[PDB]
């Protein structure tokens, strides 16, 4: 459901906020939004390409770990821009 | 006339964008120039703050004063202004927060005087002229 992916991403951000420094969370994570969940793939909207790139390069493992801790399932994480 | 915006890039990002420095140029150009929606601009500003280091002001002052001794220069707090010997040119150096700005005219020696101080302080300064599309590391 539409409200359900919002809940999942808000839960994941709240856990991520307890893991990262304030500058890293505010710069890279806080403005991200859930876009879709289809099959094994969770797609997240990043605010620009620079963010998309750094999220993919540095934070994919952390996000995958967070989703696994919350759900018990491995979801493939993908980033898109507006 | 040359106009450079010079930032001290964090090691992690310098490495990540090695061979892809145009992407950093575009990020900096978006902040200084590109007409962005307010929210895109604010994200860009946050990103720039994250990937750059504060300029080491006192260290710079010391190094500049040593290097410019008996040159035609003056200082106005964070601004240094120089005139080259034999009337060959002029350059202004301004340091603030995370940014250095340089304006130069005449011989390329003018900006080189400042770039030489910078490159001996760190290998991580990225200098960019958004007017001419000239950019690169100040290599030691």
Features of the shown structure:
heterodimer, A: 82 residues, GMP Synthetase, Chain A, domain 3, 3 helices, 3 strands, B: 140 residues, alpha+beta, TATA-Binding Protein, 5 helices, 8 strands, 41% helix, Chromosomal replication initiator protein DnaA (chain A), SirA (chain B), Sporulation inhibitor of replication protein SirA (chain B)
Q: What are the SSEs and their pairings?
A:
The complex is a heterodimer of chains A (82) and B (140).
Chain A: H1 2-17, H2 22-29, E1 33-38, E2 41-45, H3 49-71, E3 76-80
Parallel strand pairs in A: 2-3
Antiparallel strand pairs in A: 1-2
Helix pairs in contact in A: 1-3
Chain B: E1 2-9, H1 11-16, H2 21-32, H3 38-51, E2 52-53, H4 57-68, E3 72-76, E4 79-83, E5 89-96, E6 99-106, H5 109-121, E7 125-129, E8 134-137
Antiparallel strand pairs in B: 1-2, 1-6, 1-7, 3-4, 4-5, 5-6, 7-8
Summarize the structure.
Chain A has helices at 2-17, 22-29, 49-71, and strands at residues 33-38, 41-45, 76-80.
CATH class group of chain B: Alpha Beta
Count of individual helical segments of chain B: 5
Shape call of chain B: globular
Taking Cα atoms only, what radius of gyration of chain A do you get, to the nearest Å? 12 Å
Count of separate structural domains of chain B: 1
N→C terminal distance of chain B: 24 Å
Structural class of chain A: alpha+beta
CATH superfamily placement of chain A: DnaA, N-terminal domain
The CATH topology assignment of chain B is TATA-Binding Protein
* Gross CATH architecture of chain A: 2-Layer Sandwich
**CATH homologous superfamily heading of chain B:** Sporulation inhibitor of replication protein SirA
Work out the helix count of chain A: 3
- What fraction, in percent, of the residue positions of chain A are helical? 55-70%
What's the gyration radius of chain B in Å?
A: 15 Å
Percent range of helical residues of chain B: 40-55%
Largest sheet of chain A: 3 strands, mixed
Identify the quaternary structure here: heterodimer
Subcellular location (chain A): Cytoplasm; Cytoplasm, Nucleoid
Organism (chain A): Bacillus subtilis (strain 168)
Protein name (chain A): Chromosomal replication initiator protein DnaA
Family (chain A): Belongs to the DnaA family.
């Amino acid at each position: 459901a539409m409200e359900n992916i919002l809940d999942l991403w808000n839960q994941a951000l709240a856990q991520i906020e307890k893991k990262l420094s304030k500058p890293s969370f505010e710069t890279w994570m806080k403005s991200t939004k859930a876009h879709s969940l289809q099959g094994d793939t969770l797609t997240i909207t990043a605010p620009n390409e620079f963010a998309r790139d750094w999220l993919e390069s540095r934070y994919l493992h952390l996000i995958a770990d967070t989703i696994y801790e919350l759900t018990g399932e491995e979801l493939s994480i993908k980033f898109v821009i507006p | 006339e040359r106009h450079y915006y010079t930032y001290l890039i964090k090691e992690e990002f310098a490495n990540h964008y090695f061979g892809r420095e145009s992407v950093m140029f575009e990020l900096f150009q978006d902040y200084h120039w590109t007409s962005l929606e307010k929210q895109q601009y604010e994200m860009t500003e946050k990103q720039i703050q994250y990937i750059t280091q504060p300029i080491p002001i006192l260290h710079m002052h010391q190094r500049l004063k040593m290097n410019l001794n008996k040159t035609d220069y003056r200082q106005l707090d964070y601004i240094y202004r120089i005139a080259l010997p034999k009337a060959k040119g002029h350059a202004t150096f301004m340091m603030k927060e995370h940014m250095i700005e340089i304006v130069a005219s005449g011989d390329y020696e003018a900006e080189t005087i400042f770039f030489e101080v910078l490159r001996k302080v760190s290998p991580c300064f990225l200098a960019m002229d958004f007017n001419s599309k000239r950019y690169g590391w100040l290599n030691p």
